[PDB]
Amino acid sequence: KAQWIGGTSFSDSVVITSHTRTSMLADRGGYVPVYKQGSHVDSSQPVMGMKTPYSYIDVNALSAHFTPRDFQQLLDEYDEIKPKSLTIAISAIVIKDVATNQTGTTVSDSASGGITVFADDSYDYPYVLGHNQDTLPGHLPGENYVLPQYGYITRGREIDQQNSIVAISDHKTELFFLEHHDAECLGTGDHWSHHYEFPDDLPWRKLSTPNQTLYARHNPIPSSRLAIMTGVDNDGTAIWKRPEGMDVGRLPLNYVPGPALMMPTDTQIRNTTFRDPVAIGNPATSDRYSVAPLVHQPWSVRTEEWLANKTDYAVHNYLGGVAYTRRKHEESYDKHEEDRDGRVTNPSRVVQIDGDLAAPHVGHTFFVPGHTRVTSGGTDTVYSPKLYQEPVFPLFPGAVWNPNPLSYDCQIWTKIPNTECHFFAQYPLLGGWGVLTPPPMIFVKLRSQPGPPSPGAHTVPQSNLNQYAIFHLHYSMQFLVKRRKRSRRHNPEKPAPFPTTDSGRMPFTLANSLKDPNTPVYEVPSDQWIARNYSHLL
Amino acid sequence: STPNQTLYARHNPIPSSRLAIMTGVDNDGTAIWKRPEGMDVGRLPLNYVPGPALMMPTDTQIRNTTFRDPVAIGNPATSDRYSVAPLVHQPWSVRTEEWLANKTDYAVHNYLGGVAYTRRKHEESYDKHEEDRDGRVTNPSRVVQIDGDLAAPHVGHTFFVPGHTRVTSGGTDTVYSPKLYQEPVFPLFPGAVWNPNPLSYDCQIWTKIPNTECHFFAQYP
Amino acid sequence: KAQWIGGTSFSDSVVITSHTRTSMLADRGGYVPVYKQGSHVDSSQPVMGMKTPYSYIDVNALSAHFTPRDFQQLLDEYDEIKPKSLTIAISAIVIKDVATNQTGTTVSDSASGGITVFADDSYDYPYVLGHNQDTLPGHLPGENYVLPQYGYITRGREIDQQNSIVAISDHKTELFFLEHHDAECLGTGDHWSHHYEFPDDLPWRKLSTPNQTLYARHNPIPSSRLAIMTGVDNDGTAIWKRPEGMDVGRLPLNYVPGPALMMPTDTQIRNTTFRDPVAIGNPATSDRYSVAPLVHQPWSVRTEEWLANKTDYAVHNYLGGVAYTRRKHEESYDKHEEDRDGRVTNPSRVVQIDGDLAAPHVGHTFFVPGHTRVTSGGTDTVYSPKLYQEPVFPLFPGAVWNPNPLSYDCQIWTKIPNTECHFFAQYPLLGGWGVLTPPPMIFVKLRSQPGPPSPGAHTVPQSNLNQYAIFHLHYSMQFLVKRRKRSRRHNPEKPAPFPTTDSGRMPFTLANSLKDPNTPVYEVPSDQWIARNYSHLL
Amino acid sequence: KAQWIGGTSFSDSVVITSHTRTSMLADRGGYVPVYKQGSHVDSSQPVMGMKTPYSYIDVNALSAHFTPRDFQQLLDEYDEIKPKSLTIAISAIVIKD
């Protein structure tokens, strides 16, 4: 009994989304390492790497599970979505044989073919899901999903021999043969499904924007009963000032904002580019590795211009911010690999509208007193210290922040690195939900059929029979949700902005022709859809 | 057991990322984006940052002058201080294999603020040698990690060479030239991952968490 | 229900190792004898031989069952491994048809094909397993295992007619048609498994090195209470000497070493080579047959040089020693058959570190008294007898020795020849475990499909349809093991040396490129891994 | 019943290490304070201190509990050691004059 699965079901409790897509297994070569030496002149760093004949299914995004309309209803009626479960089923396996002839390529069923699939419930192989690498089902059903090959990075002893750093691999090099593991041989007419359930421990990710500025919550009517020290006068007077309720910037507050990198966003107009936005490394010029979204901050802020409420607001993209690259939708001969070093035009930028818990901000202590009169001219040296602008405002004990919202393309989960102690790891900087035990990587490969054996004559094994498998991939995921409790207010509350396409056409639809009749162009919004829809009092 | 993988390289070297990091702005507001390939380990945006780090110099100063104290939170310009020596969980000393033909004796780098167990005298008679004062100790056990660490030894928070930040670029409100790229003490952020120091064979087994109102990760001394 | 089997499981009691490999059955010709006449000028000796259309599976090595890492953990945590069981399962049988055309070779499934497999539980066919002949699964999964053809040697009446000896075969010639025996026809979608259990009588083979020199075990403090006769003085004085405890060489001992051949190892530098190392034969020059590892001794000893503790120790290879030939790992067009007479460069030499129960030794009675004064000048003749150096120190009643350790490539079992009386046969000189009833030879052959029958016209049967079978071969083996009881000692005990590759790269890993980009080179240690890891008091 | 205790026992679950050592109690003086004044020129900082006639037993190290070989096997076969318990017994007290 194979049934095509699809459609979503909303309930008050739970959201159940189901897709099915024809998938393909290319024949992947045998285990091959990919060793790319690093260079200190560039930013390259040595990777030992491995490539595997196996291929896995990466279903991890919201965009995969929620149809755009299903993502719309998600926000309208709900708040606090948390993922509950994930099923994946391979079914309708059919394995073609590609026979290359001078006549031509003739594909024909192989009644004898098979595929071999298994999942890691033991997490015993390098867990490659959740790093936001583009292997996903195309947004369009009817766009075949060709399963990504599986590979994994491993490190050796990494030495700086010269301008170029190389890994000699005399340690810590691992070779995982997935061949050696219990897997389930499948063949035409076999159904393999793997059900999985996220921890109950996952946090509820709010779908709604905080109402109030963090630092302005109080009664504008009364004066405070506290007196902040403004500064000293008349040599030791230490004048005190009692802030009125209205004074929002000046009122002492119980709870500080979360951390901030206070990075420049389009404040540098200079044509020069940062090699890397934020990188914790210990080479003056020798090397580095980025920590890009090092904090939970808007990657890009709307920041409405003021020229008569300019129609196109200036969108500020913070260095270290991240934008989802728009995939090519059934796009033929536009691959345009000739653009190198991965320059990407017009990515989805995840622009927040500055409904943030706290306005975008950059200076830890910004003030203009003049000298601090401790370390005032300089400390013990020529070094002029305790400079007022301090980058990276740090996390203090009393503190409050919200992580990034859920973009429609946001990754759903990721694997909290297996490590002794971790801190707020449940909120990944880059995505939805850190999980200790994630959805297993489901490894699939064509059962290899070798060619005719030689009578021990030339000792070169004939290449495997060229063949490929195509199958339905059922993947259903259940989300726990809570219907929104509307703030009880007398105002109609302006909805989150409906998506906008550069084209001006409706988003997530097939446009007839963009300078072609041939194929329709599926249109995605100019910017990343953000799951934050309605205010809620903080 | 030692962690296998570099923190920042865990992913499939085969695919390109589906994210685009902003590399920098061009042509006055172009804001060029770059999609890192899977292989690019340093350049790939990551969900989980390293733990804190003091980025202290280890044998990079060759100067015969010595630090009175390695790390000390105190509020006297010259009046007083008290050390916080192993202020973070970091290798106290890293092996850091030399490269001269894979030199047989690797240069062991001892981070200031690192700590080494003093070798006790084993039934050692009349070698007490108290005449050496101020507790100068020769050849202590240095707890040298081999740099199998979760993340390689590292020192700069934001290290880059753009030129001016073009916020507080020449200076802030003053002559003070601010937001200097090298920031010491890379701080603990909300998403973060680290491992505490391993268990040396001489490592103390327990300690008493000070009786105090609120403590943070006190279970790992 | 066919499931791919793999992975190992360690327990305190038992080790269970499982592999699965795509296998192939070539079409082997009909029964053909191979008769090679012998020559007395050379060492050749006549063999009647037989070749069979059948093919068998030889799974016998440790390297097959234990993944290198699984062999590592074997030593770290265990001692005394003994083999418990062996399962073999053929499954996922698929039988291609090779159609040769002027167009080209087109393989296509044959829904009608079959294979015919059976096992000898009666040992009624010549048992060919366990002689260390290279038919084994390649170390790399993904290296197809093409089952070896089956053949057997038989002897006739062997006469020296001339310089060349020939077997006339007027006796003792046997013809085994495996066709005539009960076997199980298999076809696409059939599962055939054969479970087997070693005797309980097998000895525990220690994985740990003896601590103490055999001849030095005693209290260094006391003097002995025995007096050895050193020699006679003053014409009949017969001076006696009481050895002190420290004197290890001179102290009389209850238990002698095992046998020894005291063979020269690299002491001959001469370019001349031994035709055969050790051969019990009765032809002055007419003929011989080797007994190569005639005793349990180190085949090769490390024997550390002294030049400032020279980094590369001089490895001494005892004549009659044996070394495992390194197989070519997915190695293409390096077959290099042009090297003839089987000259092999750089085999795995099974080098012991001289942790032996007794140091390497060569002289039975070595002494320099001068004449024995029995048979002193000569015996009854010119022959000068009872020469002090006696080769082949013999096994005496009180005696103690250890057999060779278990190399990672060591064969697991062998069949004790069916014979009236045998002596210590349970320890094969060359390998792991002699067994009375070994794992059955599992004979497999393609079910033969003849070509179109002629209308009795040319009376030459059309060749069989060219076809070959490929299938999964599950082979699981269980080992009984005992966790090590650590010698209770205050010292950390230096581990057995980790493997070393000539390349310097980590052993048992895929190296990217050796002067090629094309395929990775799987790297095996310079010398045979030895299963002896930690000392234990003897 | 006084028995000399020693030796370690490894199990899959738990590691049990035992040592026994002849110990001595010196006669320690009465309560004495040690007051060392601090100096800003140096790094010295004032400590009031106290010294007690009492003496305590500090058993706290891994090296104390794990014999080097017992520490070796610890690593070879195990991971994730956490301390479970600690017993201390004074016995065979004999007091010289």
mmCIF file of C-alpha atoms in Angstrom, chain A residues 305-473:
data_model
loop_
_atom_site.group_PDB
_atom_site.id
_atom_site.type_symbol
_atom_site.label_atom_id
_atom_site.label_comp_id
_atom_site.label_asym_id
_atom_site.label_seq_id
_atom_site.Cartn_x
_atom_site.Cartn_y
_atom_site.Cartn_z
ATOM 1 C CA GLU A 305 14.342 56.769 5.589
ATOM 2 C CA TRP A 306 12.990 60.221 6.152
ATOM 3 C CA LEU A 307 12.492 61.951 2.868
ATOM 4 C CA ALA A 308 8.747 62.504 3.011
ATOM 5 C CA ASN A 309 8.437 58.896 4.221
ATOM 6 C CA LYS A 310 10.424 57.658 1.195
ATOM 7 C CA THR A 311 8.627 54.890 -0.635
ATOM 8 C CA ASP A 312 11.717 52.657 -0.822
ATOM 9 C CA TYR A 313 13.266 52.532 2.624
ATOM 10 C CA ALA A 314 17.012 52.217 2.931
ATOM 11 C CA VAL A 315 17.660 48.672 4.080
ATOM 12 C CA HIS A 316 20.744 48.446 6.273
ATOM 13 C CA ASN A 317 22.627 45.152 6.156
ATOM 14 C CA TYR A 318 24.826 44.599 9.184
ATOM 15 C CA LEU A 319 28.227 43.144 8.428
ATOM 16 C CA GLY A 320 28.151 39.597 9.626
ATOM 17 C CA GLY A 321 24.505 39.485 8.677
ATOM 18 C CA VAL A 322 23.332 36.604 6.535
ATOM 19 C CA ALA A 323 20.934 36.380 3.613
ATOM 20 C CA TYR A 324 19.395 33.334 2.003
ATOM 21 C CA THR A 325 20.469 32.853 -1.590
ATOM 22 C CA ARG A 326 17.574 32.603 -4.006
ATOM 23 C CA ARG A 327 17.595 29.208 -5.641
ATOM 24 C CA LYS A 328 16.986 28.823 -9.350
ATOM 25 C CA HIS A 329 13.444 27.539 -9.872
ATOM 26 C CA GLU A 330 13.415 25.087 -12.796
ATOM 27 C CA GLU A 331 15.804 27.576 -14.345
ATOM 28 C CA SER A 332 17.454 26.228 -17.493
ATOM 29 C CA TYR A 333 20.902 27.314 -18.739
ATOM 30 C CA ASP A 334 20.923 30.220 -16.269
ATOM 31 C CA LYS A 335 23.369 28.312 -14.039
ATOM 32 C CA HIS A 336 25.937 31.011 -14.850
ATOM 33 C CA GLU A 337 28.767 29.305 -12.978
ATOM 34 C CA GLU A 338 31.036 31.764 -14.816
ATOM 35 C CA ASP A 339 30.410 34.069 -11.867
ATOM 36 C CA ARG A 340 33.015 32.825 -9.431
ATOM 37 C CA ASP A 341 33.910 33.329 -5.787
ATOM 38 C CA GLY A 342 30.180 32.988 -5.154
ATOM 39 C CA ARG A 343 29.139 36.594 -5.722
ATOM 40 C CA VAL A 344 25.369 36.524 -5.255
ATOM 41 C CA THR A 345 23.009 39.251 -6.405
ATOM 42 C CA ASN A 346 19.744 40.021 -4.644
ATOM 43 C CA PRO A 347 19.581 37.424 -1.854
ATOM 44 C CA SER A 348 16.673 37.269 0.553
ATOM 45 C CA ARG A 349 17.861 39.551 3.315
ATOM 46 C CA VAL A 350 15.620 38.742 6.313
ATOM 47 C CA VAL A 351 14.826 42.412 6.868
ATOM 48 C CA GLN A 352 13.337 43.189 10.244
ATOM 49 C CA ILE A 353 11.100 46.229 10.436
ATOM 50 C CA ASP A 354 12.625 47.360 13.735
ATOM 51 C CA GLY A 355 9.767 46.080 15.828
ATOM 52 C CA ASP A 356 12.665 44.796 17.906
ATOM 53 C CA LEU A 357 12.635 44.461 21.674
ATOM 54 C CA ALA A 358 15.206 47.258 21.637
ATOM 55 C CA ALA A 359 16.025 49.651 18.826
ATOM 56 C CA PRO A 360 19.215 49.045 16.818
ATOM 57 C CA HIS A 361 22.051 50.389 18.905
ATOM 58 C CA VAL A 362 25.823 50.628 18.839
ATOM 59 C CA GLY A 363 27.837 52.149 21.643
ATOM 60 C CA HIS A 364 28.160 50.539 25.030
ATOM 61 C CA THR A 365 28.956 53.780 26.890
ATOM 62 C CA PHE A 366 28.763 56.617 24.361
ATOM 63 C CA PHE A 367 29.180 59.743 26.427
ATOM 64 C CA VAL A 368 30.921 63.088 25.956
ATOM 65 C CA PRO A 369 32.127 64.122 29.445
ATOM 66 C CA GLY A 370 35.696 64.592 28.404
ATOM 67 C CA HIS A 371 38.282 62.599 30.355
ATOM 68 C CA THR A 372 37.175 59.741 32.604
ATOM 69 C CA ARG A 373 39.676 61.088 35.234
ATOM 70 C CA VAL A 374 40.609 57.496 35.902
ATOM 71 C CA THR A 375 43.094 56.515 33.155
ATOM 72 C CA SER A 376 42.197 59.928 31.732
ATOM 73 C CA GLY A 377 45.143 60.864 29.516
ATOM 74 C CA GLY A 378 46.496 57.346 29.474
ATOM 75 C CA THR A 379 46.912 54.352 31.751
ATOM 76 C CA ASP A 380 50.426 53.254 32.590
ATOM 77 C CA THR A 381 51.551 54.019 29.041
ATOM 78 C CA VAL A 382 51.008 56.059 25.886
ATOM 79 C CA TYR A 383 47.930 53.890 25.327
ATOM 80 C CA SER A 384 44.805 56.022 25.768
ATOM 81 C CA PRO A 385 42.491 53.576 27.530
ATOM 82 C CA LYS A 386 38.880 52.853 28.488
ATOM 83 C CA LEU A 387 37.727 54.398 25.235
ATOM 84 C CA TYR A 388 34.046 55.240 25.463
ATOM 85 C CA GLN A 389 32.982 53.250 22.423
ATOM 86 C CA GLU A 390 33.205 49.623 23.378
ATOM 87 C CA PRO A 391 32.314 47.092 20.663
ATOM 88 C CA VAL A 392 30.504 43.889 21.513
ATOM 89 C CA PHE A 393 28.302 45.042 24.399
ATOM 90 C CA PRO A 394 28.509 41.939 26.633
ATOM 91 C CA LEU A 395 25.919 39.713 28.218
ATOM 92 C CA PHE A 396 25.452 40.679 31.870
ATOM 93 C CA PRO A 397 23.591 38.795 34.581
ATOM 94 C CA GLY A 398 20.321 40.635 34.403
ATOM 95 C CA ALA A 399 19.569 40.578 30.691
ATOM 96 C CA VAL A 400 16.779 40.015 28.210
ATOM 97 C CA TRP A 401 16.787 39.413 24.484
ATOM 98 C CA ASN A 402 14.927 37.633 21.761
ATOM 99 C CA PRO A 403 16.577 35.431 19.195
ATOM 100 C CA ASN A 404 16.072 35.998 15.521
ATOM 101 C CA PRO A 405 12.578 35.325 14.187
ATOM 102 C CA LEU A 406 11.717 32.424 11.944
ATOM 103 C CA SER A 407 12.248 33.255 8.360
ATOM 104 C CA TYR A 408 10.217 31.269 5.891
ATOM 105 C CA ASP A 409 13.521 29.795 4.748
ATOM 106 C CA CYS A 410 14.898 29.401 8.265
ATOM 107 C CA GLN A 411 16.424 26.030 8.980
ATOM 108 C CA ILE A 412 14.306 24.046 11.354
ATOM 109 C CA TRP A 413 16.855 22.283 13.503
ATOM 110 C CA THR A 414 20.534 21.842 14.093
ATOM 111 C CA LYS A 415 22.674 19.564 16.200
ATOM 112 C CA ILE A 416 24.042 21.131 19.349
ATOM 113 C CA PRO A 417 27.707 20.113 19.124
ATOM 114 C CA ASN A 418 28.434 17.231 21.426
ATOM 115 C CA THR A 419 30.464 19.059 24.034
ATOM 116 C CA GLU A 420 30.847 19.250 27.751
ATOM 117 C CA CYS A 421 29.121 22.538 28.514
ATOM 118 C CA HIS A 422 27.097 24.757 26.205
ATOM 119 C CA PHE A 423 25.293 28.035 26.769
ATOM 120 C CA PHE A 424 21.860 28.865 25.336
ATOM 121 C CA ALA A 425 22.650 26.335 22.649
ATOM 122 C CA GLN A 426 18.955 25.678 22.121
ATOM 123 C CA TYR A 427 18.794 28.904 20.162
ATOM 124 C CA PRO A 428 21.047 28.616 17.132
ATOM 125 C CA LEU A 429 22.283 31.954 15.927
ATOM 126 C CA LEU A 430 21.521 31.055 12.362
ATOM 127 C CA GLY A 431 18.290 29.116 12.581
ATOM 128 C CA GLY A 432 15.345 27.641 14.369
ATOM 129 C CA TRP A 433 16.019 24.993 16.992
ATOM 130 C CA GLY A 434 19.156 23.505 18.380
ATOM 131 C CA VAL A 435 18.535 19.882 19.277
ATOM 132 C CA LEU A 436 20.666 17.421 21.209
ATOM 133 C CA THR A 437 19.437 14.448 19.209
ATOM 134 C CA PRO A 438 18.443 15.711 15.800
ATOM 135 C CA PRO A 439 16.544 14.002 13.032
ATOM 136 C CA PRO A 440 18.829 11.206 11.892
ATOM 137 C CA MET A 441 20.681 11.607 8.675
ATOM 138 C CA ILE A 442 19.037 9.130 6.344
ATOM 139 C CA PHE A 443 21.747 7.695 4.126
ATOM 140 C CA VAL A 444 20.739 6.209 0.797
ATOM 141 C CA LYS A 445 22.723 4.640 -1.992
ATOM 142 C CA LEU A 446 22.116 2.584 -5.089
ATOM 143 C CA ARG A 447 22.879 -1.032 -4.483
ATOM 144 C CA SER A 448 25.975 -1.357 -6.596
ATOM 145 C CA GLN A 449 25.854 -3.743 -9.525
ATOM 146 C CA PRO A 450 29.318 -4.459 -10.903
ATOM 147 C CA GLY A 451 30.007 -5.213 -14.520
ATOM 148 C CA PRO A 452 30.974 -8.511 -16.055
ATOM 149 C CA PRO A 453 33.907 -10.047 -14.221
ATOM 150 C CA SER A 454 37.075 -10.530 -16.210
ATOM 151 C CA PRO A 455 38.717 -13.880 -16.191
ATOM 152 C CA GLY A 456 41.454 -12.316 -14.043
ATOM 153 C CA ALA A 457 42.860 -10.847 -17.251
ATOM 154 C CA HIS A 458 43.443 -7.082 -17.160
ATOM 155 C CA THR A 459 42.777 -6.757 -13.393
ATOM 156 C CA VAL A 460 40.753 -3.586 -13.933
ATOM 157 C CA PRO A 461 37.193 -3.990 -12.613
ATOM 158 C CA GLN A 462 34.564 -3.002 -15.135
ATOM 159 C CA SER A 463 32.742 0.119 -14.038
ATOM 160 C CA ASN A 464 29.479 -0.479 -12.237
ATOM 161 C CA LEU A 465 26.453 -0.735 -14.463
ATOM 162 C CA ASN A 466 25.275 2.812 -14.933
ATOM 163 C CA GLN A 467 21.914 3.125 -13.250
ATOM 164 C CA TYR A 468 19.918 5.510 -11.114
ATOM 165 C CA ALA A 469 16.944 5.231 -8.812
ATOM 166 C CA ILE A 470 13.870 7.426 -8.720
ATOM 167 C CA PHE A 471 11.379 7.269 -5.902
ATOM 168 C CA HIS A 472 8.743 9.129 -3.981
ATOM 169 C CA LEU A 473 10.008 10.833 -0.859
#
